[PDB]
Point group: D3
Chain length 235, copies 6
């Protein structure tokens, strides 16, 4: 099968890293295609940039010419999932929901550790909408400005594990979810350091996407995600 | 003062109808500037068109070069308010939240009457995010396509009252919220035909916008709606 | 138009101060009438005094002989709103709900800062009933015994801003709501000190009351707030 | 021990009916003292009369000059419990909460059957405040005016069973709570006619009052129900 | 009447202590029978042991040969209540729910103080299911390994009151509920030390059980707790 | 890898049907080992049999002496998952949560169709505990007794589609979850007859089990599902 894995931000280096991580868990016969949107912010930080990224991602998927069997939106706490669901006749998985949903099988309560404080309420709102928030102990920001993870990977790792530890100790999280795709593959280190399973939405999304295809499942087109009624649309 | 009233769809005649109902209640000294987005669907029906309209609305507002005091987004149940709240340092009122918020001063419970069944869950989700759904007895669809409103208003009118009556008698609604911009000015007739206050989010949003301006209040910039960090963003 | 603004407590000096603040935002042609109930506690502190104030206020409004177009209950976290709504055929706004409701347009979450700790659960319960509590980050008590604000206005101001800062820093409030009418007009100082919009329910209620009259809206009499069935009542 | 059983309305014959059902289940050694408030509506139907009854009940209790061990407020869905809890240092039981609380020991879900449609939302709100609504499948109105109960009991009886059956079959109620004091003693006939346990809040409140006394338990005075601070209060 | 009081754990010394405490509040003519299950853990600590105790307790009750009028499950936060309810044609009260339910008449919010941290989410889940959790301020663990209360009753008492004080001061609990039956009778000391009523589920359950029998109430057999359909069951 | 698929009831033919549907979707390299508990009801209908099945399932798993990588509990709405999660250091998937969790990727809301009305509230409660009920539009019973499924499948089939249609049209379900193990493989026919994706928790649980294994993830042992403390436990 073919799975499109779309970055929500325009940074080509992040697309390839995410895609690589998707390729490391993909099943035999699964082809992962990483896609960079044509427009949008280099890192998606806030409501404005999130809504720009929602249509950036859908523009990017609707440009792809080859057949494909699933789409993964590779961004934590951003908009657009639902619009993809309407546009496409294949399953869509967003990594936010892939992480929280897989975490819920593992523990009484899960926490998410993201980058910026200002992205906490967007991630919270995404999960509440998904109906996944009941078992979320908290969504916590490490505080590192997105691009520093390649500059100081040590200061980053430390800031992240400090939040993981507060979530386990104060919020009673039993599993940690990564909260920017740019965190893919750092999960073993966080596990080594906390003694809890640590879910990476990128890899979790691949398995859920692969599963829905194996099960013959796709978005319901009955109501909310009906194909859009063809009409006059500009631009 | 100057208030931008922005249509979520690209049909310019609907923009004039909305801006004229707005002017019909604006305080002396208030200028209404009705804006039609430059791109997007001619009527916004579903998630894909809602997200496109979100960004189409923001683009239209950011292109306006005069000063203004508040903005009103004149669509029911669409995405975008939060985007605008980050970009602007004037208050933003969404007619969805304007209607429900005012209705709650008037009755134990309110119901919204929209056009299409498929917009019902988009509306519920906006209300839920806003923390305004506890007092909503239901969102009901009249079944009338957005544009069939100036076509056959007498049938539109009857379809709306039909649903309003069902909300009152079965849902225990005590107040009715109109749920398309295209319904602006219809409240008086529905009030007469139902026996309950009928709230027009267009005219309610005007009063709320004017209030927030008179009161010296604007969007909090402390966290969630802080100005977007300056950064690279294509297009 | 005419708007009655009723103190919930019997202190004549508080009625006049509230009314003055209402007069400073009222629109041209709006007449504000401040009313002191004939009975009740000099400051309303707790369930017993709140229920006494509920009927004190309704007794006070039903005594007023002149026509009027709206009523404001000028008390934070007290009972009685609903009984006014049944008694009257004009809109009723309580300042508790005017503050929370206006705050919700301004920020992701709002907090209320009141005087006594023991009034926190009454205000919480009022907002939960109003269906306004979802976006309330916390209700916090400054701790100053009600009447000290005229004695030590500095110690008061300080205690208040300390709670505002805890709400923003720990509870993630993005807007502050004042929580005793006796706090009217202190909002600029709190804003100066926190960098967030600060809503005063007194002035916010005036605009909402004025709006409902301009929009031709009044309480729904369909069910819950039906006129009371005339019957034998004593005293 | 001595338990005050206080009618919420001023009809003395209803006070005797309630106090006699109470006596029918009181433990040996328990004295029931049935009280009729001095002012208020002859039947309490709506918010205005509910708030008046709240204060009318408290006045009546504070006028009683003998000692007593507990108080029961014998009205369904009325205001006042909290007022009494502040003023008294003996336990207070409201028959509303007494019924629902006991019903929850007996079935997965309960429903209340009251008289008037307009009291339905007052009842729901009391249950919600009490934290007892999660297990309530519904509150249904029999449509019988409060006093039409000793007038035509055979029609009252049938109206109640009608609603009870609807709650069981459509709402999935497994237990029925009578929802006027005027229905005391009817449970046996409804049980027979419905097939489910039927709870009488009057008699349940007696057992709970007696329990709290036997157990040495009374209202917590630490915070919300602390004695009212001594202060000036007119009338 | 006869009331069975069943230990959830297999420790004979705990059964007799619980039963003694039940006998100290029982009404005249009430016979308390303490029962020890034939199998299960010596102290019930966790999901596995709780589910073993659920069927241990039902096995123990179904072995008892004499008539009886009620059953009390004498364990805090364990499973099985519902299965008893199906099996029996008499009322069942679990002490978890007896404590929380009686506490709710006493104060704005209640807290539970139990032994082990790992039992906190089971007790939380039990109360959420019971629909009693809305008014629960927190469930807190003292941390003492179950059997130390007979070894160091002083270190135990201290650990317990420390949690009670955190619940009142930080969680705003107004009443404390004991949270292992092995705590029966320690409530006066905790009351002496905190100034709040302290509910013991053992004694509270006796009064609720006695009440349901006096009121002629028993489990509803209409749906969820219908007698199990006789069929082939092994072992 | 090896995955234990455990029937909740003792009917061995139902164990083979479940294990064969599981094998029909298992990845190459995956071994399915279908287990029939040693004691318990021949079909699990209600709380008593649910609790017995919980412990019967755990006993069966603990008796298995080979190594394995994950366990699946193949019953809808039964107790036990948490028990297994404490005892095991391999992931555990319950088909109840497997179905609902996967369904949520596919539609705005899902509904479950089970057999017996009396299992409906057991199912709702499992979903609620799991934090998966927010997106559940309803749980409906087909009315078909568990074993009447291989007896008359054409009538079973029609009973299920009947309920599915009612969930879609009245409950606004967009996806259907089969709610007995005995329904495994029926999804294709129901999909055809309803027009919406149909999820089989048996086959979904397999994909999720395999995913968690591929991802290196297992049950968190930090708190709620820590191994049971070693201690005395009879039988």
């Amino acid at each position: 099968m073919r799975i499109l894995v779309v970055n929500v931000n325009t940074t080509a280096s992040i697309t390839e890293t995410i895609a690589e991580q998707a390729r490391a868990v993909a099943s035999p016969g699964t082809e992962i295609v990483g896609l960079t949107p044509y427009f949008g912010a280099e890192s998606v930080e806030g409501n404005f940039e999130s809504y720009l990224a929602a249509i950036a991602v859908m523009d990017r998927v609707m440009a792809y010419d080859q057949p494909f069997d699933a789409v993964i939106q590779a961004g934590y706490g951003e908009h657009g999932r639902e619009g993809l669901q309407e546009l496409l006749n294949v399953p869509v998985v967003d990594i936010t929901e892939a992480a929280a949903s897989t975490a819920m099988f593992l523990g009484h309560a899960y926490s998410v550790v993201t980058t910026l404080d200002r992205t906490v309420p967007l991630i919270e709102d995404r999960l509440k909408l998904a109906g996944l928030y009941q078992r979320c102990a908290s969504v916590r920001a490490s505080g590192m400005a997105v691009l520093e993870l390649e500059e100081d990977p040590v200061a980053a790792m430390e800031a992240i594990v400090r939040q993981a530890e507060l979530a386990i100790r104060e919020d009673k999280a039993e599993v940690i979810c990564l909260g920017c795709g740019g965190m893919a593959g750092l999960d073993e280190q966080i596990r080594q350091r906390t003694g809890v399973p640590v879910v990476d939405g990128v890899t979790a999304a691949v398995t859920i996407a692969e599963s829905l295809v194996r099960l013959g499942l796709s978005t319901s087109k009955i109501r909310t995600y009906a194909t859009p009624r063809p009409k006059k649309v500009i631009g």
